[PDB]
Amino acid sequence: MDKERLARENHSEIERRRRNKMTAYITELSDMVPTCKPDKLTILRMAVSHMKSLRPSFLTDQELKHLILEAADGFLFIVSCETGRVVYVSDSVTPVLNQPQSEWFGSTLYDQVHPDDVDKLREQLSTSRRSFICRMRCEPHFVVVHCTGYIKAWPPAGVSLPDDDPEAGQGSKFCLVAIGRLQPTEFISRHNIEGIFTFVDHRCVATVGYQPQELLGKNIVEFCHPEDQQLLRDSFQQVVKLKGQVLSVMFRFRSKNQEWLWMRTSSFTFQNPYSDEIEYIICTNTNV
Amino acid sequence: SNPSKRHRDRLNTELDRLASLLPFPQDVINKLDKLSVLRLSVSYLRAKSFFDVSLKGVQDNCRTKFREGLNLQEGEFLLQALNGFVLVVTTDALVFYASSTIQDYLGFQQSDVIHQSVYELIHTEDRAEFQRQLHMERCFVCRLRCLLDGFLAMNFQGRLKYLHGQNKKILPPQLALFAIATPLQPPSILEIRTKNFIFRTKHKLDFTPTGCDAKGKIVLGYTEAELCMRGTGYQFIHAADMLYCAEYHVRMIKTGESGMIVFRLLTKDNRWTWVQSNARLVYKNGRPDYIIATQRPLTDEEGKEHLRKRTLKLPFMFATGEAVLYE
DNA sequence: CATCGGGCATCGCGTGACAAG
DNA sequence: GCTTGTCACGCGATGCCCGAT
Ligand SMILES: O=Cc1c2[nH]c3ccccc3c2cc2[nH]c3ccccc3c12
């Protein structure tokens, strides 16, 4: 409808919006500077005033750290990939783990975690991104910590390493720099003949509230009511004597809400088609 | 000369002096346009005013010079350990702040994002969701535009805290979202994209592994000893494939050949990887001796395709889950 | 104590030049 | 060879300042 006029009008309104944006930004500046109705040049000169006073990165290092910590907590730690030796730990370790900056220094990440986890720690430290879940200590008491970090070449650029520094003789080649933060259905599962979860169906979440990683490695009897524990144990012991035969047992499984749920478990054995030996026990666990 | 041009020249002089003081590298300041000069001046002032009231160190018991140097970078260290970026969004859905690493994950320049609408970065179908999260702790997912493709799904974990020192009108502070955005973890799956990657494994008659080639170590992640110390191969099989593998093992026992089967193996990362395998019986003096399985790794797409076109229909066919393996 | 006319400064508008994409 | 956006410019309508009433 007369392209030349459409182009003209839309261009006119475009820089009309531009002028309005400029005026609005100047008004914000007027709202945000000290001394302040003044005109545009006054506000701009006082903005130069304030910005010269306040002053590369948009934030300082402490402002960036403040933003991150306000966002999602966490404490930073930097350990050597060789021995797990704690090179650095932030003060955030006190509000996160209730531990002084001092218990981690001169120490080792393996000494700060649960023993049953140290192996996994080696897994995460041997030889970019890393993400794991462990138990760190705060009788001793431990707590689940989600750790997210990366492998960095050591020493870091910019930081001066003096001669008489304790870090001067270590000479580690790689480091882990990470943040640690505190954080009517049925499902199938596979166990060894002792009762340890070796395979967990995802539906367990909708069934008992646990995630599969919370069940794998644990014996099922650990989740059973103390009065039903021997019954479930003998169910497991009998299903091994009767190859292929199905055994059902009802017991109380403690959901992660620490609530007792009545569950029916049907168990049988998987036989190796050549040797007829047992590979594992298949259980189907249903709510009641 | 003339008065209009005089006034415009004074305005441009003040604008250039504002640009000179912006806390950005010179190559970023030179490419800036006057409107975004004003925009990031305003944003810097708002940030400094918030930090003036909300903000304010090694333990002197454990202070060395090297530790002081590391403490002076603690913030950037946290930012790098985030595996993502920081976002602080006002109630007007304005980006109060975004860290530089947003460019690492979406391709947007930090100076182009700050003090701009957040919805310009978020997929339309998700914008509504984001709004509901803006109005204490917060944990959700959103698809943000990724100029490195085009979108990327990301988990936002954050909180709603009062954004002090904004001097609105005087109105009280409003709740801003302080969150960390991190990419979405792909499902616990391993898909070798290196083409032409067929690998062979050797087993004894009960499918307990005894040997494996280099590509097998690369895909499965076990050392040669590690493969043979964790029971038979049935300790490595996804529970949705155990019965099919047992049937094909019986077929190989009866005919020497198993036929092409598709199933999932457990890596050392405890991930599942698809393989189309074929098991042959080798003989010694006319009696079966060991098994030679030759496997070709598959993607998740064609793996689920093969599963959906399954010949036999056995129990646990559509089950999904996780597993562990011990020696 | 105002009110009133100068001359220049602010200010908003539409258009044309120019370039990155 | 087209789209969008930035920048300068001309151009008047009001603003501010201030002798002069
Ligand atoms: O134990 C079944 C198995 C198998 N177990 C493994 C453990 C580690 C590495 C490789 C394998 C492996 C390869 C296989 N290829 C097969 C074809 C037909 C039937 C069964 C299989 C089978």
PDB file of N, CA, C and O (backbone and C1' of nucleotides) in Angstrom, chain A residues 8 11-12 15 19 39-41, chain C residues 10-17:
ATOM      1  N   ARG A   8       8.731   4.673   5.028  1.00  0.00           N
ATOM      2  CA  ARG A   8       8.940   5.958   5.686  1.00  0.00           C
ATOM      3  C   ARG A   8       8.304   5.980   7.071  1.00  0.00           C
ATOM      4  O   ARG A   8       8.940   6.376   8.056  1.00  0.00           O
ATOM      5  N   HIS A  11       9.992   3.597   9.598  1.00  0.00           N
ATOM      6  CA  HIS A  11      11.287   4.134  10.011  1.00  0.00           C
ATOM      7  C   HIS A  11      11.122   5.292  10.992  1.00  0.00           C
ATOM      8  O   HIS A  11      11.846   5.380  12.004  1.00  0.00           O
ATOM      9  N   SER A  12      10.182   6.197  10.700  1.00  0.00           N
ATOM     10  CA  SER A  12       9.891   7.300  11.610  1.00  0.00           C
ATOM     11  C   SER A  12       9.520   6.778  12.990  1.00  0.00           C
ATOM     12  O   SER A  12      10.071   7.224  14.005  1.00  0.00           O
ATOM     13  N   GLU A  15      12.660   5.230  14.952  1.00  0.00           N
ATOM     14  CA  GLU A  15      13.501   6.098  15.773  1.00  0.00           C
ATOM     15  C   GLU A  15      12.695   6.941  16.758  1.00  0.00           C
ATOM     16  O   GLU A  15      13.278   7.492  17.695  1.00  0.00           O
ATOM     17  N   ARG A  19      14.160   7.361  20.425  1.00  0.00           N
ATOM     18  CA  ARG A  19      14.163   8.558  21.261  1.00  0.00           C
ATOM     19  C   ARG A  19      13.513   8.286  22.611  1.00  0.00           C
ATOM     20  O   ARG A  19      14.009   8.736  23.654  1.00  0.00           O
ATOM     21  N   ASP A  39      17.666  18.748  33.662  1.00  0.00           N
ATOM     22  CA  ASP A  39      17.501  18.408  32.258  1.00  0.00           C
ATOM     23  C   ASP A  39      18.456  17.271  31.889  1.00  0.00           C
ATOM     24  O   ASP A  39      19.141  16.704  32.744  1.00  0.00           O
ATOM     25  N   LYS A  40      18.516  16.933  30.597  1.00  0.00           N
ATOM     26  CA  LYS A  40      19.262  15.753  30.169  1.00  0.00           C
ATOM     27  C   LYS A  40      20.760  15.916  30.394  1.00  0.00           C
ATOM     28  O   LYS A  40      21.423  14.989  30.873  1.00  0.00           O
ATOM     29  N   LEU A  41      21.314  17.079  30.040  1.00  0.00           N
ATOM     30  CA  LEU A  41      22.752  17.282  30.183  1.00  0.00           C
ATOM     31  C   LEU A  41      23.172  17.255  31.648  1.00  0.00           C
ATOM     32  O   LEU A  41      24.228  16.706  31.985  1.00  0.00           O
TER      33      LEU A  41
ATOM     34  P    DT C  10      21.782  23.402  26.868  1.00  0.00           P
ATOM     35  O5'  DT C  10      20.386  22.671  27.140  1.00  0.00           O
ATOM     36  C5'  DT C  10      19.253  23.016  26.356  1.00  0.00           C
ATOM     37  C4'  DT C  10      17.983  22.421  26.924  1.00  0.00           C
ATOM     38  C3'  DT C  10      17.844  20.931  26.736  1.00  0.00           C
ATOM     39  O3'  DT C  10      16.856  20.438  27.634  1.00  0.00           O
ATOM     40  C1'  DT C  10      16.432  22.058  25.207  1.00  0.00           C
ATOM     41  P    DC C  11      16.547  18.867  27.727  1.00  0.00           P
ATOM     42  O5'  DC C  11      15.452  18.634  26.587  1.00  0.00           O
ATOM     43  C5'  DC C  11      14.278  19.436  26.567  1.00  0.00           C
ATOM     44  C4'  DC C  11      13.376  19.044  25.414  1.00  0.00           C
ATOM     45  C3'  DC C  11      13.542  17.606  24.927  1.00  0.00           C
ATOM     46  O3'  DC C  11      12.269  17.002  24.812  1.00  0.00           O
ATOM     47  C1'  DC C  11      13.703  19.110  23.104  1.00  0.00           C
ATOM     48  P    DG C  12      12.114  15.406  24.839  1.00  0.00           P
ATOM     49  O5'  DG C  12      11.148  15.117  23.604  1.00  0.00           O
ATOM     50  C5'  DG C  12       9.972  15.897  23.443  1.00  0.00           C
ATOM     51  C4'  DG C  12       9.578  15.987  21.982  1.00  0.00           C
ATOM     52  C3'  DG C  12       9.616  14.661  21.223  1.00  0.00           C
ATOM     53  O3'  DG C  12       8.435  14.524  20.454  1.00  0.00           O
ATOM     54  C1'  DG C  12      10.905  16.285  20.084  1.00  0.00           C
ATOM     55  P    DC C  13       8.044  13.109  19.802  1.00  0.00           P
ATOM     56  O5'  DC C  13       8.083  13.408  18.234  1.00  0.00           O
ATOM     57  C5'  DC C  13       7.476  14.592  17.730  1.00  0.00           C
ATOM     58  C4'  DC C  13       7.915  14.857  16.303  1.00  0.00           C
ATOM     59  C3'  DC C  13       8.078  13.603  15.442  1.00  0.00           C
ATOM     60  O3'  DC C  13       7.252  13.699  14.295  1.00  0.00           O
ATOM     61  C1'  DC C  13       9.976  15.034  15.239  1.00  0.00           C
ATOM     62  P    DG C  14       6.752  12.371  13.546  1.00  0.00           P
ATOM     63  O5'  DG C  14       7.402  12.500  12.095  1.00  0.00           O
ATOM     64  C5'  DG C  14       7.295  13.726  11.386  1.00  0.00           C
ATOM     65  C4'  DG C  14       8.386  13.835  10.342  1.00  0.00           C
ATOM     66  C3'  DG C  14       8.615  12.564   9.523  1.00  0.00           C
ATOM     67  O3'  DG C  14       8.498  12.860   8.137  1.00  0.00           O
ATOM     68  C1'  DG C  14      10.677  13.397  10.400  1.00  0.00           C
ATOM     69  P    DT C  15       8.727  11.719   7.030  1.00  0.00           P
ATOM     70  O5'  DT C  15      10.222  11.986   6.537  1.00  0.00           O
ATOM     71  C5'  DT C  15      10.673  13.325   6.368  1.00  0.00           C
ATOM     72  C4'  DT C  15      12.132  13.362   5.958  1.00  0.00           C
ATOM     73  C3'  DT C  15      12.569  12.241   5.012  1.00  0.00           C
ATOM     74  O3'  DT C  15      13.388  12.779   3.987  1.00  0.00           O
ATOM     75  C1'  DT C  15      13.988  12.305   6.882  1.00  0.00           C
ATOM     76  P    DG C  16      13.515  12.037   2.569  1.00  0.00           P
ATOM     77  O5'  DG C  16      15.093  11.877   2.372  1.00  0.00           O
ATOM     78  C5'  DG C  16      15.933  13.018   2.474  1.00  0.00           C
ATOM     79  C4'  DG C  16      17.333  12.625   2.914  1.00  0.00           C
ATOM     80  C3'  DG C  16      17.953  11.453   2.146  1.00  0.00           C
ATOM     81  O3'  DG C  16      19.268  11.796   1.735  1.00  0.00           O
ATOM     82  C1'  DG C  16      18.115  11.086   4.472  1.00  0.00           C
ATOM     83  P    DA C  17      20.115  10.815   0.785  1.00  0.00           P
ATOM     84  O5'  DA C  17      21.361  10.397   1.696  1.00  0.00           O
ATOM     85  C5'  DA C  17      22.137  11.404   2.336  1.00  0.00           C
ATOM     86  C4'  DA C  17      23.267  10.793   3.149  1.00  0.00           C
ATOM     87  C3'  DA C  17      24.015   9.653   2.469  1.00  0.00           C
ATOM     88  O3'  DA C  17      25.398   9.731   2.785  1.00  0.00           O
ATOM     89  C1'  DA C  17      23.004   8.864   4.471  1.00  0.00           C
TER      90       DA C  17
END
